[PDB]
Paper text:
RgNanOx (RUMGNA_02695) from R. gnavus ATCC 29149 catalyzes the equilibration of 2,7-anhydro-Neu5Ac and Neu5Ac. The novel oxidoreductase identified in our work showed to catalyze the conversion 2,7-anhydro-Neu5Ac to Neu5Ac in the presence of NAD+ in a reversible manner. The protein shows a Rossman fold typical of NAD-binding protein of the Gfo/Idh/MocA class characterized by a central β-sheet with helices on either side. Here, we showed that RgNanOx acts through a multistep mechanism involving a keto intermediate and cycling of NADH/NAD+.
RgNanOx forms a dimer in the asymmetric unit, and the NAD+ cofactor can be seen bound to the protein. In the RgNanOx structure, there is additional density adjacent to the nicotinamide ring that, given the high resolution of the second structure, we were able to unambiguously identify as citric acid from the crystallization buffer. Oxidoreductase proteins typically have a catalytic triad of K (found in the EKP motif), D, and H (often found as a DXXXH motif; in some enzymes Y replaces the H) and a fourth residue, which is positively charged. RgNanOx has Lys-93 and His-178 which correspond to the Lys and His of the catalytic triad, and Lys-163 occupies the “fourth” position. However, RgNanOx has His-175, which occupies the position typical for the Asp in the catalytic triad. The closest structural match (0.8 Å over 341 residues) is the recently solved crystal structure of YjhC oxidoreductase from E. coli, which also has a HXXH motif. The following mutants of RgNanOx were constructed: K93A, K163A, H175A, H176A, and H178A. The purified mutants lost enzymatic activity, as demonstrated by electrospray ionization spray MS (ESI-MS), supporting the hypothesis that they are catalytically important.
Numbering used by the authors:
A (entry chain A): -1 to 205, 209 to 372
B (entry chain B): 1 to 205, 209 to 369
Write the structure that this text describes.
């Protein structure tokens, strides 16, 4: 029984890109043909035992490149996805898809028009506890979802070098760089809100031009709401998603790692990740890095925690399945139709606008009933 | 020790109990009460007179001070007439259901030279007082952010209480204004700009909003988030205070205070003893499925934690009315600053929500 090989290029072979390469390489029917990275491409090509390309059009033009993993910095996703689509190459793109809805919409439409595949790297949807939460919600356990509350709040000391992840024009700041929590809320509420308000600023880090506190206030259709908090100036650390419905509530805690279901007077626990060891390992890490959350951000030469390494495996395996003709499940459909890429960058843009312009923003002000 | 004669206007759950308390303080007598419904009953218990007209009641020689504990909508008439007749005033939260109403009440009492104490009882919680001591000493550094919540689940009762009618209670924002007052005290004033969202999500048929989310912008790059309501199946009741060097949590569901500074973590009591804190926690656990039973009625009794701060407060008030100097700590409960700041910001939030836009507090002060 043959089983067809797909040739993968990797564009951007830093912390996350290098590791997606290590992972895809060892999946069934998958080969790393070549990578592109001006800084770290020679190094990671020696490790993966593949070629080095320096031009996108040359790279995509190769017969042996049928698919590309895009993991450049957040601001540099546009050019690699558009050229792969132009050369008939299927695409996986890291979060955040882009730093503007214009950019994200052009990327999804180009890939649709050239009939290639576009998978959005919204990796939180592969977390065991997120999947369990969706199963419980769809089964009607907590009833209709009324309210989601996210937070991703820690304290970051000012480092010796300022990373690109810390520059707003390159990272898009906390809202874009940690968009997982916005995407998560949007998935659980079944789409975008009608209207957002975001406040915050740089409260403690004025000396890294990023906002260090952000507070979002979302109004959804048919009387539902959400509140989302981010940043790097909170001396009381918090990282969770809370889901409150007509019959019950669910908490996915990522600081004290565990899931909680509340129904009647009853209270069940469930795993966020693949095993009690992964959950407990996460909890140890957050305890260790309470005084300085800055050490938690990846660099070329560092390695992801267990919980993250495992969902990267789940995700690279799901992607490889798709590219071998596997049917997509309703559960992950929105990572390919483009609905989730668009919904996350739309709402992010809407929030960014709200804050810089000091006013409430309708999501129509970013969509416009486009196509 | 001189005797002060107190009238009580409104002798339901809270008013009756403030009377029981003041009665047994040094230099304090309950001369008479007024309550169409429950006045005859509570006058038999307190062994005092019954009046049916405010002007007649205040006109008595023997009435030098009034405790006002009518429903939230009915504070205006009793405070203005007491001021007109030279009578000193204590008024229950929320002072009024409009800034116009609250401003008129503070100015009338100032103009007639009588005393006006705002019943912002959360400021007498041991853990609130401790939090202020820590903040002012510089332990957590500059306060950047406050996060309050008061979120539980209320089942729909057989009869609709006035506390559940928006026109009469002013809804969660006014009826549970303690948390807004608390944040305003810790941030040292009102915000520059507010946004409030929410609605009736689960209770359509009790016209109150059952979820409210406030987003406050303060001067010099500071913020707060405040949550309220009666449609949350994950109960939460706390105030969290995050600064440049540390953070403090006052938890009222899992009752205890927490200080975080460097890698250190200290516990402190919210209330007067570990028994009061634990008693609170038991109650919140007991009433998780229906927080509606926690709201007072004529004939019912406040928890230990609440009974005790009512004692702290009635004693502080009685001290003031015996010529005791006010401490900087409670000054704003008499100057009118706290009554005005709480109803201004509440009005601003209410406006924001019904009009679907951000509201500057200049739009209420100016
Ligand atoms: N899904 C997740 O959980 C997760 C976690 C971390 C990072 N990420 C995402 O991964 C992507 C990369 O982030 P990272 O953590 O690897 O950062 P990083 O600094 O570790 O990696 C960036 C790499 O891109 C290279 N690069 C720079 N310019 C390039 C160009 N023009 N073409 C190709 N490569 C170029 C850099 O030299 C570096 O090797 C981002 O989209 C980021 O948001 C995702
Ligand atoms: N500070 C606190 O912790 C706290 C707690 C509960 C209530 N309160 C406040 O106490 C006040 C009353 O609340 P409650 O719990 O006692 O409500 P309640 O229903 O228990 O008592 C209200 C009483 O006012 C009487 N009343 C009605 N109209 C009147 C009028 N025109 N003149 C005089 N009395 C009149 C009613 O008959 C009733 O006896 C409100 O301001 C409320 O917000 C404060």
């Amino acid at each position: 029984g043959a089983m067809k090989t797909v040739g993968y290029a990797i564009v951007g072979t830093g912390y996350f890109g290098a590791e997606l390469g290590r992972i895809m390489k060892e999946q069934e029917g998958a080969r790393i043909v070549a990578v592109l990275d001006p800084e770290n491409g020679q190094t990671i090509a020696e490790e993966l035992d593949c070629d080095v390309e320096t031009d996108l059009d040359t790279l995509y033009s190769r017969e042996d490149v049928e698919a590309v993993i895009v993991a450049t910095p957040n601001y540099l996703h546009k050019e690699p996805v558009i050229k792969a689509a132009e050369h008939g190459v299927n695409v996986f793109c890291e979060k955040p898809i882009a730093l503007s809805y214009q950019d994200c919409d052009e990327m999804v439409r180009t890939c649709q028009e050239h009939g290639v595949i576009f998978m959005a790297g919204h990796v939180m949807n592969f977390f065991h506890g997120v999947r369990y939460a969706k199963k419980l919600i769809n089964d009607g356990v907590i009833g209709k979802v009324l309210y989601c509350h996210s937070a991703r709040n820690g304290w970051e000391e000012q480092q010796p070098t300022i990373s690109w992840k810390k520059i707003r024009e390159k990272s898009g700041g906390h809202l874009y760089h940690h968009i997982h929590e916005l995407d998560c809320v949007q998935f659980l509420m079944g789409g975008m809100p009608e209207e957002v308000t975001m406040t915050g600023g740089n409260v403690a880090h004025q000396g890294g031009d990023e906002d260090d506190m952000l507070f979002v206030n979302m109004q959804f259709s048919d009387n539902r709401y959400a509140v989302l908090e981010w940043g790097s100036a909170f001396h009381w650390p918090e990282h969770y998603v809370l889901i409150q419905g007509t019959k019950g509530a669910i908490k996915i805690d990522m600081c004290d790692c565990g899931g909680t279901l509340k129904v009647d007077g009853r209270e069940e626990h469930f795993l966020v990740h693949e095993s009690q060891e992964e959950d407990d390992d996460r909890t140890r890490i957050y305890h260790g890095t309470e005084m300085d959350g800055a050490i938690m951000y990846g660099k070329p030469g560092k390695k992801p925690p267990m919980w993250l390494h495992s969902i990267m495996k789940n995700e690279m395996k799901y992607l490889n399945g798709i590219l071998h003709g596997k049917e997509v499940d309703d559960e992950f459909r929105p990572l390919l139709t483009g609905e989730a890429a668009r919904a996350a960058i739309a709402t992010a843009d809407a929030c960014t606008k709200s804050r810089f312009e000091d006013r409430k923003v309708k999501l129509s002000e970013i969509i416009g009933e486009g196509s």
